[PDB]
Amino acid sequence: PMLL
């Protein structure tokens, strides 16, 4: 997942 991407934590941006």
Side-chain angles (χ1 to χ4, degrees):
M2 299 185 239
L3 309 181
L4 304 178

